Design a protein around this ligand. Sequence first.
Ligand SMILES: CC(C)CCC[C@@H](C)[C@H]1CC[C@H]2[C@@H]3CC=C4C[C@@H](O)CC[C@]4(C)[C@H]3CC[C@]12C
Ligand SMILES: CC(C)CCC[C@@H](C)[C@H]1CC[C@H]2[C@@H]3CC=C4C[C@@H](O)CC[C@]4(C)[C@H]3CC[C@]12C
Ligand SMILES: CC(C)CCC[C@@H](C)[C@H]1CC[C@H]2[C@@H]3CC=C4C[C@@H](O)CC[C@]4(C)[C@H]3CC[C@]12C
Ligand SMILES: Cc1ccc(C(=O)Nc2nc(-c3ccco3)c(C(=O)C3CCOCC3)s2)cn1
Ligand SMILES: CCCCCCCC/C=C\CCCCCCCC(=O)OC[C@H](O)CO
Ligand SMILES: CCCCCCCC/C=C\CCCCCCCC(=O)OC[C@H](O)CO
Ligand SMILES: CCCCCCCC/C=C\CCCCCCCC(=O)OC[C@H](O)CO
Ligand SMILES: CCCCCCCC/C=C\CCCCCCCC(=O)OC[C@H](O)CO
Ligand SMILES: CCCCCCCC/C=C\CCCCCCCC(=O)OC[C@H](O)CO
Ligand code: NA
Length: 391
Amino acid sequence: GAPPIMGSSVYITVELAIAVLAILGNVLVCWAVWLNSNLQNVTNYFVVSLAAADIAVGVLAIPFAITISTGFCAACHGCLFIACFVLVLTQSSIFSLLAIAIDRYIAIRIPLRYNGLVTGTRAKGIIAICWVLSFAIGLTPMLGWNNCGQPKEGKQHSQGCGEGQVACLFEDVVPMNYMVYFNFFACVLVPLLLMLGVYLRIFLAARRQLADLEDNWETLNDNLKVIEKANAAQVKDALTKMRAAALDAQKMKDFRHGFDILVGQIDDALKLANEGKVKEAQAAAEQLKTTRNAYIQKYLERARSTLQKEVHAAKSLAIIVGLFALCWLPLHIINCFTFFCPDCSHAPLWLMYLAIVLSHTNSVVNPFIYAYRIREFRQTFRKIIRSHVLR
Ligand SMILES: CC(C)CCC[C@@H](C)[C@H]1CC[C@H]2[C@@H]3CC=C4C[C@@H](O)CC[C@]4(C)[C@H]3CC[C@]12C
Ligand SMILES: CC(C)CCC[C@@H](C)[C@H]1CC[C@H]2[C@@H]3CC=C4C[C@@H](O)CC[C@]4(C)[C@H]3CC[C@]12C
Ligand SMILES: CC(C)CCC[C@@H](C)[C@H]1CC[C@H]2[C@@H]3CC=C4C[C@@H](O)CC[C@]4(C)[C@H]3CC[C@]12C
Ligand SMILES: Cc1ccc(C(=O)Nc2nc(-c3ccco3)c(C(=O)C3CCOCC3)s2)cn1
Ligand SMILES: CCCCCCCC/C=C\CCCCCCCC(=O)OC[C@H](O)CO
Ligand SMILES: CCCCCCCC/C=C\CCCCCCCC(=O)OC[C@H](O)CO
Ligand SMILES: CCCCCCCC/C=C\CCCCCCCC(=O)OC[C@H](O)CO
Ligand SMILES: CCCCCCCC/C=C\CCCCCCCC(=O)OC[C@H](O)CO
Ligand SMILES: CCCCCCCC/C=C\CCCCCCCC(=O)OC[C@H](O)CO
Ligand code: NA
């Protein structure tokens, strides 16, 4: 078994490489939102909170990981802080990702209430509350749910640690019942399933609304055929069904003018039908075809286009949740094997290190997803790189 420092040097060089990239990419997300008022919306205040957490992975969590890989002597509680700090940043990340999912759900379910419900001031209060709770949840072991009462006495003597000191190793100070039941099941796995459920409700809500728009459009076009097939109470029933469906599409000016004309043309055809002038009502009904073209088809296409953008945007933010789950799951599955299967062989050291590195890599990927999938970030990223790196 080779000298530890050789494999130690690979791990550390890789961790520092990740730290550099996590800082630069996330500082760019923050710089972007700062410079571009098109990126200054409540969704992006949670994107910045998540960027801040990923900066703190590079500045603090990776230096801590490096430090704790040495097994240096420390007072147990100072060891606990170094061991648990990254759990604060993961919890802060779960909260930001959950808030973004709920924000997007509100934006698609009740867009007319969104601006009055989700403001900057409330979003900042929520972010502040979520950072407090993330410190409380991630440093719980420091409240006394910890192995500091039961030091490894053989490691403590072989490394020449002093009174009160331990060999600082994550798995010697953080209980696995905490890491599995409390950190994984309650604080990570339940919130990811909840976010899965909200994204499912966004995609369904979008699909039902696109359907309703296609449906309304088909009633008009269908009922034009029901009118144009020569009875007068027959035309009345088709016209009564188009007046419901014109209203339902409605429920500023270029917009609200098309529908005024439309209900105008329908009520005109209605008056003729009540009187009983079938032929007049049929001619009255063909004017509508022209109002459909120059107005109604424009509203429909615009409503479809907005919903499709919400679907694409919601796909992009869900890719970010998937990549979080992917990057952290291996470390959680390893703790689950350690806890639930004490007869199972432990993961080799090299694979522990790979699981840790994969977890840090999550703090690099988000800036790439914004660059690839969101025009406004991408364009802002060029302006900033062209100005400040080109020059
Ligand atoms: C503003 C930010 C950057 C400040 C960062 C402070 C960090 C580096 C400080 C705060 C608390 C500190 C720990 C507190 C106590 C101990 C126990 C001791 O036996 C070994 C050092 C150790 C483990 C310290 C390491 C450094 C530490 C983690
Ligand atoms: C929805 C998905 C992503 C959640 C992840 C499921 C996790 C919790 C599952 C997947 C594989 C599972 C492990 C598979 C095998 C064993 C061996 C057994 O002797 C103890 C339980 C243990 C260790 C399981 C614990 C739970 C486990 C880690
Ligand atoms: C999901 C993508 C990113 C790939 C990662 C897959 C994860 C789930 C795999 C990669 C290597 C795997 C580990 C490899 C070896 C062992 C030792 C054995 O005694 C128990 C299972 C355990 C601890 C495995 C658990 C699951 C594991 C961590
Ligand atoms: C047999 C064995 C040894 C070590 C471990 C172990 O270290 N699990 C571990 N799980 C996690 C974890 C985090 C989230 C879910 O899980 C770790 C870390 O994020 C540490 C990496 C170094 O900086 C200190 C934090 S460390 C588990 N089982
Ligand atoms: C989401 C997309 C992420 C995709 C990116 C891939 C993730 C892995 C990254 C780099 C590989 C680093 C390999 C080196 C890992 C450490 C291995 C090691 O140092 O060996 C330890 C030795 O055994 C101790 O004694
Ligand atoms: C704004 C950017 C600032 C970012 C800040 C960068 C931090 C400095 C870089 C690496 C620290 C590496 C951690 C030091 C680990 C030392 C391990 C140790 O102390 O070993 C004791 C010895 O093993 C007893 O026997
Ligand atoms: C890329 C820009 C980076 C920004 C500037 C930061 C430079 C820090 C350089 C090296 C950190 C390595 C620290 C070495 C600490 C580990 C010493 C050690 O391994 O302890 C002895 C033995 O392993 C006990 O078990
Ligand atoms: C923007 C602000 C930048 C802030 C930058 C912060 C970087 C933190 C660096 C290292 C973590 C601390 C490493 C802890 C080193 C412990 C060494 C120790 O305690 O040694 C005791 C004894 O020597 C055992 O043998
Ligand atoms: C100690 C254990 C703590 C562990 C941390 C667990 C986090 C769970 C917290 C909140 C879940 C929120 C439920 C999300 C369900 C969807 C809500 C929704 O759809 O809200 C729309 C409404 O219109 C809004 O105004
Ligand atoms: Na993160």
